[PDB]
Amino acid sequence: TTPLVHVASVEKGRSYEDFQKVYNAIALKLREDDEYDNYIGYGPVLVRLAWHTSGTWDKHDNTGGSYGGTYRFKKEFNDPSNAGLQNGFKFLEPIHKEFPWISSGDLFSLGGVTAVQEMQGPKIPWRCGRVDTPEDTTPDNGRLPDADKDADYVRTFFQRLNMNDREVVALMGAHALGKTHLKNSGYEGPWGAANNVFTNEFYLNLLNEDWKLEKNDANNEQWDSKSGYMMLPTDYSLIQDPKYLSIVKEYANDQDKFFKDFSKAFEKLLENGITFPKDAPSPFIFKTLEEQGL
Ligand code: FMI
Numbered sequence: 001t002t003p004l005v006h007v008a009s010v011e012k013g014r015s016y017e018d019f020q021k022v023y024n025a026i027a028l029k030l031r032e033d034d035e036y037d038n039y040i041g042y043g044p045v046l047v048r049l050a051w052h053t054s055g056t057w058d059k060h061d062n063t064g065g066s067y068g069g070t071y072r073f074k075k076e077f078n079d080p081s082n083a084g085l086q087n088g089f090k091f092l093e094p095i096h097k098e099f100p101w102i103s104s105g106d107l108f109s110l111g112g113v114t115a116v117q118e119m120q121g122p123k124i125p126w127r128c129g130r131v132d133t134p135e136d137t138t139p140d141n142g143r144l145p146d147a148d149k150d151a152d153y154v155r156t157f158f159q160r161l162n163m164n165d166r167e168v169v170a171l172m173g174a175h176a177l178g179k180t181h182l183k184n185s186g187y188e189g190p191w192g193a194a195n196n197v198f199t200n201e202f203y204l205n206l207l208n209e210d211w212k213l214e215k216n217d218a219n220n221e222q223w224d225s226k227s228g229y230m231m232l233p234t235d236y237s238l239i240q241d242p243k244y245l246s247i248v249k250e251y252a253n254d255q256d257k258f259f260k261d262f263s264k265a266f267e268k269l270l271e272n273g274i275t276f277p278k279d280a281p282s283p284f285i286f287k288t289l290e291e292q293g294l
Helices: 016-032 043-054 086-098 104-118 151-159 165-176 201-208 233-240 242-252 255-271
Strands: 212-215 221-224
Touching: 016 043, 016 086, 016 104, 043 086, 043 104, 043 165, 043 255, 086 104, 104 255, 151 165, 151 233, 165 201, 165 233, 165 242, 165 255, 201 233, 201 242, 221 233, 233 242, 242 255
Parallel strands: none
Antiparallel strands: 212 221
């Protein structure tokens, strides 16, 4: 029961070039399967997948986390909190088939990095080495957060993932991506207009839109704006709490600062629970398809 240690182990003989190839395959498929979710594309769901497979981590005993790639097991696969992520997993299936040597954890996390970068977000340094672990290492459902709570809940919840106020506010900025789907979470609507482009729009919308607390078709409360945008109760709590509000304003006024902070927090999130040997490769920074002329 003692807190186990997960040491990163580089996939046998693999290096930067090998992972850039996986990144490219993911990016090329993101470009090809552009019709998904009313042309939003698979970018957003891949980011959510990367986060959900990492967000089960508990700093107290190092259980859960991105290391094991346990989402491939039924218990986690069927977590109500992961409803809808099967689309992301299906997307990665052909990728894993072409590169069977990559671990599940590395693939799930790399999918998130690839999505953010291809959607014009900041570069996210990424490290390889996650190793698949047995089905009995799969964390129980209920470790992922709820969206119907307030700022105090958010702050306390994220302490389990060792994230502070700035890290939490920065991570939530990813909600500029995709949308909520009534069938998956009991919420409906997008947070903004640039559904598949990574920008700081989440913060601008929180501050500039005229929000009204309404009930959706699932009988859940959510904040709506005449522009057709929505915010979860937890999203809105970021402007209700004075400390979170200050940070929201900072990111709404500094795109570069948001990109830099999100990059650090996202990499941290994807690496929580992993021990990287002193002589492990330095983090990889993958070139986008655009940068490669592909
Ligand atoms: C890594 C960034 C990130 C973080 C940190 C983070 C944190 C948290 N998220 Fe969020 N998320 C991200 C990225 C990130 N999210 C993305 C990209 C989406 C869009 C998914 C899609 O469009 O398919 C979504 C969609 C989504 C939805 C709609 C799901 C659906 O109906 O398909 C809900 C209800 C929530 C709830 C919550 C919280 C508030 C409760 C778990 C929360 O704490 N999210």
